[PDB]
Design a protein around this ligand. Structure first.
Ligand code: CA
Ligand code: CA
Ligand code: CA
Ligand code: CA
Ligand code: CL
Length: 426
């Protein structure tokens, strides 16, 4: 087979890459694996390489080595150049990861993933899966996310006007879908249904969850739904972080139909609030919130007909001092008649609907000089409670994952960056 058919003397002078020495199909690797591509040149003398990861030059080496140490997806090009010509091959690579095997946590202005099976944290999964895209959440900015319709709807509360404030991120994959401008200093987000949401902060804005156009329905300086919920065709809102205010509700259909400036009717419920507190849908099918009282708080049951049942809790609820400080929110179980809530000392109470005895002592005791600085989250499949703690004196935050029985299962070190929210991909 000496000199017969194809040989070097008849195959051009630009780089000649041997077949199969560069992937012809998209690569899928496990977390921890390394992608290695070593193109073999028939004529390698004087050749130079350029490896582009998502269009950005990563290497000039004749062999590509890239550790898949984070959930990612990337486009890969290889430009091989010599005196006589330039050749370019392209492929793509991604990690074989499962975002069902743990939870996302919003810290240092991005989506981070913690695997409860591997006990491993992956920082800034949003960038590595979206070609370096950022969500632009600065230190003095807020991230308000609602997981609905299999999407993460993010509202950035920022003083910058000419930037995207509202983002749609796929909840299962963490893939960016769309984003748009709404307005500066807007930190109140409500998802009404599959088609519409509400953005509050300077009154009420309806946002179309497909086109991302918004209509300013009500214009009221500093009017913000710090917390809200959809219940029996109404939007229940918490619009205070300090001042005495009552829970107010709006009609979902009136909010959907309202034209620019047509402020909708607002009705008050006999629920005095003097701080940020959320609304939780409990296993009894009712909505619960808290009412501010002199020597504690009241766990308020909001029935379908919007009548109220109130149970006194001899403890003050956890609170942040500023407009920017997040809601130290409650969390309800979907499988048990339970609500977890945080006292002002950093203790967790497990309220058992209808039984006021469950409020006589904390479920999880407080630790001195340690406070709970984010809303509670619960894993509805295991019953695991995710609590965000901050050591006041050193500014070191952690996510502690407790079992149904209150035993520590995981500790996620977050350092100087406080996680604001915990999300699931399902
Ligand atoms: Ca190697
Ligand atoms: Ca109605
Ligand atoms: Ca009892
Ligand atoms: Ca850890
Ligand atoms: Cl609209």
């Amino acid at each position: 087979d000496d000199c017969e058919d194809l040989h070097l003397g008849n195959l051009a002078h630009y780089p000649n890459v041997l077949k199969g020495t560069f992937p012809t199909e998209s690569q899928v690797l496990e977390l921890g694996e390394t992608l290695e591509i070593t193109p073999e040149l028939l004529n390698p003398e004087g050749a130079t390489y350029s490896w582009l990861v998502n269009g950005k030059e990563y290497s000039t080496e004749p062999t590509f080595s890239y550790k898949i140490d984070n959930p990612c997806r990337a486009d890969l090009s290889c430009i091989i150049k010599n005196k006589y010509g330039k050749v370019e091959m392209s492929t793509s690579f991604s990690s074989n990861h499962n975002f069902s095997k743990g939870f996302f946590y919003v810290a240092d202005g991005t989506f981070n993933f913690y695997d409860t099976e591997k006990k491993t944290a992956y920082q800034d999964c949003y960038a590595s899966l979206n070609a370096g895209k950022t969500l632009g959440i600065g230190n003095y900015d807020s991230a308000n996310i609602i997981h609905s319709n299999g999407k993460f709807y993010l509202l950035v509360g920022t003083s910058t006007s000419n930037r995207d404030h509202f983002y749609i991120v796929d909840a299962k994959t963490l893939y960016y879908e769309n984003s748009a401008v709404v307005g500066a200093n807007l930190s109140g987000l409500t998802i009404l249904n599959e088609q519409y949401g509400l953005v509050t902060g300077d009154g009420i804005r309806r946002i179309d969850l497909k086109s991302l156009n918004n209509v300013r329905i009500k214009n009221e300086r500093l009017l913000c739904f710090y917390n809200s919920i959809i219940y029996n065709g109404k939007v229940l809102s918490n619009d205070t972080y300090k001042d005495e205010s009552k829970v107010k509700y709006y009609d979902v259909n009136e909010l959907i139909a309202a034209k620019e400036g047509e402020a909708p009717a607002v009705t008050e419920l006999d629920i005095i609030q003097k701080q940020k507190i959320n609304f939780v849908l409990a296993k009894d099918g009712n909505v619960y919130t808290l009412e501010s009282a002199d020597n504690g708080c009241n766990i308020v049951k909001i029935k379908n007909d919007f009548t109220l049942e109130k149970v006194f809790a001899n403890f003050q609820p956890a609170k942040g001092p500023y407009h920017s400080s997040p809601t130290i929110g409650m969390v309800a179980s979907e499988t048990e008649n339970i609500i977890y809530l945080v006292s002002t000392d950093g203790a967790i109470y497990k309220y058992i609907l209808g039984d006021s005895d469950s409020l006589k002592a904390p479920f999880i005791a407080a630790e001195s000089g340690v406070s709970i600085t984010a809303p509670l989250q619960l894993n509805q499949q295991s019953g695991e409670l995710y609590v965000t703690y901050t050591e006041e004196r050193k500014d070191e935050s952690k996510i502690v994952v407790y079992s149904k029985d209150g035993k520590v299962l995981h500790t996620v070190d977050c350092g100087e960056s406080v996680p604001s929210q915990i999300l699931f991909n399902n």
